[PDB]
């Protein structure tokens, strides 16, 4: 047995956080393929979301690795289908992405508060090291994108959506 200072409550919340990262990965998978449709065709938006799918997957994998390192047991649940089949405009999609990110970020903060109350400094360090700053950086970037997308709608939405995709993404 290696397990030491690792509460059952932290273990369960780690498994839930894995499910949340894998669900986010799947959402981004769906977002990316929507933007590859012939009737949507925004290559840069596609690559943005498919890159996010991969980051969220890797996030999950790091959590699973840590779960094993601490002597927890990984437990997998169903992955819920993404919340939409079609994602609207780049604007709608980027709003939905930031809502999702803020939910992951809140889950990280809740897990951290749990870690602190359980006096589990390895867990707190792990989150700080690999998750909290990355999520803050990602959210700031999405925020910046959203501001630029919004700036570009004005009178000519098609034009703005095209330019954004060509010159930013």
- Residues at the binding site for Fe cation are 51, 54-55, 58, 61
Least separation in angstroms between residue 113's CB and Au ion is 9
Cβ within 8 Å of residue 103, ≥6 positions away = 20
Rule CB under 8 A: is residue 40 a binding residue for a second copy?
Answer: yes
Rule CB under 8 A: is residue 121 a binding residue for a second copy?
Answer: yes
**Residue 111, binding choice from Au ion, a second copy, none, Cβ under 5 to 8 Å by partner class:** none
Cβ within 8 Å of residue 99, ≥6 positions away = none
Q: Please give the size of the binding site for a second copy, defined by CB under 8 A.
A: 82
Nearer CB in complex with Au ion: 12/74: 74
Q: Is 1 exposed, middle or buried (0-12, 13-18, 19+ CB in 10 A)?
A: exposed
**Residue 47, binding choice from Au ion, a second copy, none, Cβ under 5 to 8 Å by partner class:** Au ion
Token output for 64: 């699973």
Rule CB under 5 A: is residue 169 a binding residue for Au ion?
Answer: no
Rule CB under 5 A: is residue 124 a binding residue for Au ion?
Answer: yes
Stretch that binds Au ion, among 76-84, 108-116, 134-142, 148-156 (CB under 5 A): 108-116
Nearer CB in complex with a second copy: 12/41: 41
Nearer CB in complex with Au ion: 76/156: 76
For residue 111, which of 76, 54, 71, 63 has the smallest C-alpha distance?
Answer: 63
Q: Is 115 exposed, middle or buried (0-12, 13-18, 19+ CB in 10 A)?
A: buried
Among positions 7, 26, 55, 95, the unique one binding a second copy when judged by CB under 8 A: 26
| H or E element, residue 134 | helix 133-153
């Amino acid at each position: 047995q290696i397990r030491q200072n690792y509460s059952t409550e932290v273990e369960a919340a780690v498994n839930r956080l894995v499910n949340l990262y894998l669900r986010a990965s799947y959402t981004y998978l769906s977002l990316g393929f929507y933007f590859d449709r012939d009737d949507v065709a925004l290559c840069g938006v596609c690559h943005f979301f498919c890159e996010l799918a991969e980051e969220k997957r890797e996030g999950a994998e790091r959590l699973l690795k840590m779960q094993n390192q601490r002597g927890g047991r990984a437990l997998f649940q169903d992955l819920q289908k993404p919340s939409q089949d079609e994602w609207g405009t780049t604007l709608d999609a980027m709003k939905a992405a930031i809502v999702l990110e803020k939910s992951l970020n809140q889950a990280l903060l809740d897990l951290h508060a749990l870690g602190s109350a359980q006096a589990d400094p390895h867990l707190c360090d792990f989150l700080e090291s690999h998750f909290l700053d990355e999520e803050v950086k990602l959210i700031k970037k999405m925020g910046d994108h959203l501001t630029n997308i919004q700036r570009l709608v004005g009178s000519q939405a098609g034009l703005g959506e095209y330019l954004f995709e060509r010159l930013t993404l």
